[PDB]
Write a protein that binds this ligand. Structure first.
Ligand SMILES: c1ccc(Cc2c[nH]c3ncccc23)cc1
Ligand SMILES: [Cl-]
Length: 261
């Protein structure tokens, strides 16, 4: 096993961790700036986090897609090495008053998420916590689906003293997660993108959501959301999991809507 993990392991001579400085001033907890040296001697700016882990490492290392956050490696508390994301999380970015993304830009972000999700689904990977705050943006504003495998619990803060509104009806009732339940969460994420990061169901309790959805009540169309995109969101919130579109069908449908702008 210590053999099979070698290609995931980063040698202490290849990584300089800057333990004296955190990224995003506490927003992501104790995540440090880091410098990783590759085989050609190129310096890679990275984010280093302190945390059977060696196995989630092997699997995550082989997951490569431009819309999925990659795992740069692990250093043996053991350390998780990830690419540096210049513009932090997607929820934070769309909420920031300073930024003015267009309806096209917002749809483009949703398409990149669908592409990242289409790739994870093909590798039979179930996310379980898909939401705007769990997606990152790099220097070129490329969306990376994050908060899975070794990069999970990004927002778990240490003290001294379930994302139910993104969950599918069957997941709320049986605690079982599938690709079809990630399709439901993707619908909620599209709704967040179109509302520029507004909270879903603000007047409904986390305990009242099951009864609210069983009554056939759903998130309402955002003001600036095109009609075909809203039709796609409602398909994602269908009560029968088998009736929901697949992630590949989502990419096809969303890319054709994106191309009309
Ligand atoms: C654990 C903790 C934090 C993350 C988020 C993350 C990965 N790279 C980054 N670069 C800049 C800012 C934030 C991040 C993922 C797992
Ligand atoms: Cl920013």
């Amino acid at each position: 096993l210590v053999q099979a993990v070698q290609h995931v392991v980063i040698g202490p001579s290849s990584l300089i961790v800057h333990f004296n400085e955190v990224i995003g001033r506490g927003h992501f907890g104790c995540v440090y700036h880091g410098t990783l040296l590759d085989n050609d001697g190129k310096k890679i700016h990275c984010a280093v986090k302190s945390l059977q882990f060696l196995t989630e490492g092997i699997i995550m290392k082989d997951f490569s897609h431009p819309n999925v956050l990659s795992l740069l490696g692990i250093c043996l508390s053991p350390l998780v090495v990830l690419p540096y994301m210049k513009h932090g999380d997607l929820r934070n970015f769309i909420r920031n008053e300073t930024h003015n993304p267009t309806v096209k830009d917002l749809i483009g972000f949703g398409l990149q998420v669908a592409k990242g999700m289409k790739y994870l689904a093909s590798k039979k990977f179930v996310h379980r916590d898909l939401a705007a705050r769990n997606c990152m943006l790099d220097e070129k504003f490329t969306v990376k689906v994050a908060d899975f495998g070794l990069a999970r619990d990004m927002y778990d803060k240490e003290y001294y003293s379930l994302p139910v509104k993104w969950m599918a009806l069957e997941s709320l009732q049986t605690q079982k997660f599938t690709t079809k339940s990630d399709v439901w969460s993707f619908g909620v994420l599209l709704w967040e993108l179109m509302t520029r990061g507004a909270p879903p169901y603000p007047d409904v309790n986390t305990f009242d959501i099951t009864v609210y959805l069983l009554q056939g009540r759903r998130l309402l169309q955002p003001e600036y959301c095109p009609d075909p995109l809203y039709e796609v969101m409602l398909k994602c919130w269908h009560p029968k999991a088998e009736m929901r579109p697949s992630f590949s069908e989502l990419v096809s449908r969303i890319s054709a809507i994106f191309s009309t702008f």
